[PDB]
Amino acid sequence: QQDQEDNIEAVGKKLHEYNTQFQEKSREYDRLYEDYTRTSQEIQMKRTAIEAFNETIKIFEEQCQTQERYSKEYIEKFKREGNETEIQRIMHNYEKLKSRISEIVDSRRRLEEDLKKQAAEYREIDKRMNSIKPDLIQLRKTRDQYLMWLTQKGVRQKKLNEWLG
């Protein structure tokens, strides 16, 4: 009416096995979760570093703008003074400024590429976790069902301990 099993030693043996499997699967999930957290922390660090490149590039481009507006006047002056010496220095100095920007831009690009790869890793870590979770929960439940069965059967706590530990 009340619809909802072999010997005790054989159920107890399976309790030891399933518990070992639960502890092994738990430690695996713990490993991935350490990676999940570390990678999450690294990703924000990289994202903040990208903002730091963006901000550094911004100030360089202000320098470029400032160089254009500001130079304008002095370039005109030593033109009507055959001081093409100084014009040449100002322009060459400005060409060095532009060149350094290209190095900074390239560096920012290299990091964007790394953050893209690590973003893929984050998602892979999160995928593997989600394929481990059902094994983990199922193994927890099975372990608990075996204990309950043995406990109902009147099996002593010391015998249950040695199967779990």
Looking up tokens 């570093």 gives: 49
Looking up tokens 């979760």 gives: 33
Nearer to other proteins, 17 or 86 (CB): 86
Contact residues for other proteins, defined by CB under 8 A: 29, 33, 36, 40-41, 43-44, 47-49, 51-56, 59-60, 63-64, 66-68, 70-71, 74, 86, 89-90, 93-94, 96-97, 100, 104, 119, 122-124, 126-127, 129-131, 133-134, 136-137, 140
Q: How far is the CB of 90 from other proteins (least distance, A)?
A: 5
What whole-number distance in Å separates Cα of residue 113 and Cα of residue 115? 6
**The two structure tokens encoding residue 9:** 């030693």
Helices and strands: H and E segment counts in the chain? 3, 0
Q: How far is the CB of 12 from other proteins (least distance, A)?
A: 20
Q: How far is the CB of 60 from other proteins (least distance, A)?
A: 7
Select from 22, 7, 9 the least CA-distant residue to 134: 22
Nearer to other proteins, 92 or 153 (CB): 92
What whole-number distance in Å separates Cα of residue 139 and Cα of residue 33? 18
